[PDB]
From a paper:
S receptor kinase (SRK), a receptor kinase containing an SLG-like ectodomain, transmembrane region, and intracellular kinase domain, acts as the pistil determinant.
Comprehensive protein engineering experiments yielded S8-eSRK containing 11 mutations (S8-meSRK) in two lectin domains that improved the expression of recombinant protein in the insect cell system. The complex, composed of a 2:2 S8-meSRK–S8-[name] heterotetramer, forms a turned A-like structure. S8-meSRK consists of two lectin domains, an EGF-like domain, and a PAN domain with six disulfide bonds and three sugar chains. In the two [name]-binding sites of S8-meSRK, site 1 is 793.0 Å2 of the concaved surface area formed by all HV regions, and site 2 is a 444.1 Å2 crescent moon–like surface mainly formed by the HV II region. In [name]-binding site 2, the aromatic ring of Tyr275 in S8-meSRK is stacked with the plane of Asn65 side chain in S8-[name], which forms three hydrogen bonds with Asn271, Glu277, and Ser293 of S8-meSRK. In the center of the dimerization surface in the S8-meSRK complex, His297, Val313, and Asn314 are in tight contact with the same residues of another S8-meSRK molecule via van der Waals interactions or hydrogen bonds.
Author numbering:
A (entry chain B): 33 to 93, 96 to 110, 116 to 121, 129 to 146, 151 to 436
B (entry chain C), D (entry chain D): 29 to 74
C (entry chain A): 33 to 112, 116 to 122, 129 to 147, 152 to 434
Write the structure that this text describes.
């Protein structure tokens, strides 16, 4: 009953629900000299307030309370969730509306602010149509909506974008079975596992703790960097474990089409083998937006492929996937289609490797000194020897 | 969803703002300053 | 007379000085929504105004009135005093290169704008220390493109025994150039094959200063620290009608000052960035495990002074030169002996990377603010216990 | 003109401001937000 609320009401005076296991706590709060009030969830056991959810981040509430009004949680209506229904806060920080099975009627998890906790879902639901994405707060003492979001793009081959407003600043790349190149998780972590769920009802990224002495989260901070912050018992602060983007080669289309950004070269931009700079005067001034043009025209049948190693796969707007075939067939299928410009494996670790095919321009590519993937790029027969 | 655009080193200038306008012959195209000393030309309409 | 000012006045109504060559033009101007007026130089042939100097960058002319005249031994600028130089017949002359000098009408300029820079280093201008005056000439950024007042960043030489530049926000060191190796600073990454310019770092009795010169004058190039605190080379070529950012500094976190702790180096190819020097281990292993690497590394084996050896790092940005001593008269084999002979010596390196020229730099204390590169950089010999060599 | 200090990934936090002081508690240490998603601890007086 100290994590649930029924006929009762929670005033700014002064009751707080607390999750089973001590980890999270719902209540009211005012940050800084704001004299503004918000309904939110935080880590209970931490001296410095770290907020993981907020009910009214841009409808700021010295009175304001919320209880149940018919079949809904209303907050006074500053905010509301459009039989005896109980609102409960579970052990993972999800604030639920249920009947007294997980047939919840409303989750806070479906309405993220700037943070992804373990077992929260970053991605969309095809059944309901809701896309769950992170939106930055304005700054550390103001949880209202900032200018940055990190959002899964619904498409045949989904990938994440970091946006400033509606401007794409950075692109995660597609999932490869293990990871997105731009969510650079520690794959040998001892306290975390990561998952990308993709099926006919939802596609979403999630992570889970293997050891609950640690806390970890994903937050996109006020300047528009996505970071993983881990709290170890061996410290009294959140440590930034990784940060993204963290190189100009990670900035969306730092380079032009058919070139790839390389952190070990001057200039950063390099033509794919078989391609030449599109605008030679611009490139000599290191204006490389022109990208590269193929030097030998394609002949469709009898075209060939050059293999790129250690690459981040190009923007997936015009990619089609077939996970049921392998690379030899994928090449055959790419060849037959005169507009196929490149193909790659869908999932390296499976015995059926799947096929990804691009038409159109190859965009937003960078390489890596280790890791990355193969990309087979279509060339005229002559140049295909490169 | 208009996808044409590019990114460059340095800050947005007024001449670059005119260059953003070349991406599409219709629509609203502008220059956005960004992190790591880059800017981009993108279009909200086309 | 197009070019000089004498017993006359220059006011917003309305004369300007132009240079022999038509590249620059001095006069008044006011930008954007603001009604503030300023005196300064700009490129004349450029429809978008690019300002290379501003006398009263932080003392704006209040109303729409102001005057620049000579008054005895000084250039003055009044608004019905806002700015003035301080100090036979004197004339204020704007040179071909953009330098506004004060002359004896009868080299030995009394004053020059080149010595009082704003945010821009022009060709032939000097970035650094004038030993005759004791003045440090350095860049300070503007508040933004619209407001030429003084911003929060500077790029300034630290004229030590082995000098280097620091990019500062206020007084906080954000980035560091590295020392001069004979042809470059690692943090001022020029194209050493440029068709149209050359570069020099001068270290002598009169100055310690960086400078570049145009080799084909159909090109404009400059160094400018922009309002966000990046040092950029912007080039204008005849072809296009825009300034092109040819390079930007710093451009990665591995360029930020002490992104890694002592005795480690930053690498753009690794996660995490920081890497112990060989023979060294993380200094706080629980922090390194959370990828907090401010601790840097500690050496594995204790030093013996005698019989110690060195591990070779290559492709390195040489560490912060505060505790560095340079003797350019001795080569690398003797440098090793001299470093071995003093147990405070933590590392040594060549002073000049060109072929057959040489020198010796020696560090004491922690090695700080290092990073590697896939190409270029230099060798650094780090002192190790003979076991670990 | 004080010397030691450090740089980290991420923005300044209150906890970060505190760990800044324990460098030289005599001197004036402060946490500075910087570009490229870094902050630095630097102590002025010494
Ligand atoms: C979770 O991730 C692991 C990866 O280590 C994977 O083996 C497992 O099948 C995933 N399960 C779910 C339900 O996501
Ligand atoms: C959980 O973490 C602690 C310290 O990190 C470790 O000692 C313990 O073995 C971990 N639990 C498991 C099941 O490995
Ligand atoms: C300028 O640099 C060039 C190339 O290193 C060199 O030939 C010349 O001696 C330098 N000038 C001075 C004054 O050092
Ligand atoms: C200067 O550069 C331009 C552009 O490349 C070239 O056309 C011109 O001939 C050059 N002038 C000289 C004197 O080399
Ligand atoms: C090493 O450092 C100590 C510090 O006081 C100094 O006294 C000693 O002279 C130094 N070694 C040499 C060879 O100068």
């Amino acid at each position: 009953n100290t994590l649930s609320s029924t006929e009762s009401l929670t005033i700014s005076n002064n009751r707080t629900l607390v999750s089973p296991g001590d980890v999270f706590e719902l209540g009211f709060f005012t940050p800084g000299s704001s004299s503004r009030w918000y309904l939110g969830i935080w880590y209970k056991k931490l001296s410095e307030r770290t907020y993981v959810w907020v009910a009214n981040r841009d409808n700021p509430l010295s009175t304001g309370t919320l209880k149940i009004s018919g079949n809904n949680l209303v907050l006074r209506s500053i905010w509301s969730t459009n039989s005896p229904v109980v609102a409960e806060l579970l052990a993972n920080g999800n604030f639920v509306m249920r009947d007294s099975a997980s047939g919840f009627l409303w989750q806070s998890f479906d309405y993220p602010t700037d943070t992804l906790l373990p077992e929260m879902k970053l991605g969309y639901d095809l059944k309901t149509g809701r896309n769950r994405f992170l939106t930055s707060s304005r700054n550390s003492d103001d949880p209202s909506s900032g200018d940055y979001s990190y959002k899964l793009e619904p498409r045949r081959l989904p990938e994440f974008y970091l946006l400033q407003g509606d401007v794409r600043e950075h692109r995660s790349g597609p999932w490869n079975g293990i990871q997105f190149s731009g969510i650079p998780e520690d794959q040998k972590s001892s306290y975390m596992v990561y998952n990308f769920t993709e099926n006919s009802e939802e596609v979403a990224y999630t992570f889970r703790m293997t050891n609950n002495s640690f806390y970890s989260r994903l937050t996109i901070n006020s300047e528009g960097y996505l970071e993983r912050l881990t709290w170890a018992p061996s410290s009294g602060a959140w440590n930034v474990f990784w940060s993204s983007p963290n190189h100009q080669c990670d900035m969306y289309r730092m380079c032009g089409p058919y070139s790839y950004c390389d952190v070990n070269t001057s200039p950063s931009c390099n033509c794919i083998q078989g391609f030449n700079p599109g605008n030679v005067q611009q490139w000599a001034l290191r204006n490389q937006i022109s990208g590269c043009k193929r030097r030998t025209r394609l002949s469709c049948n009898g075209d060939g492929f050059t293999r790129m190693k250690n690459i981040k796969l190009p923007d997936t707007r015009m990619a089609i996937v077939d996970r049921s075939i392998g690379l030899k067939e994928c090449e055959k299928r790419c060849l037959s289609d005169c507009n196929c410009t490149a193909f790659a494996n869908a999932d390296i670790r499976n015995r059926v490797t799947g096929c990804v095919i691009w038409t159109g321009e190859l965009e937003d590519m960078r390489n890596y000194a280790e890791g990355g993937q193969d990309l087979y790029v279509r060339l005229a027969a002559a140049d295909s020897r490169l | 969803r208009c996808t044409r655009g590019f990114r460059k080193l340095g800050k947005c200038t007024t001449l670059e703002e005119e260059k953003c306008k070349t991406l599409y012959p219709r629509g609203q195209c502008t220059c956005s300053d960004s992190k790591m000393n880059t800017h981009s030309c993108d279009c909200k309409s086309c």
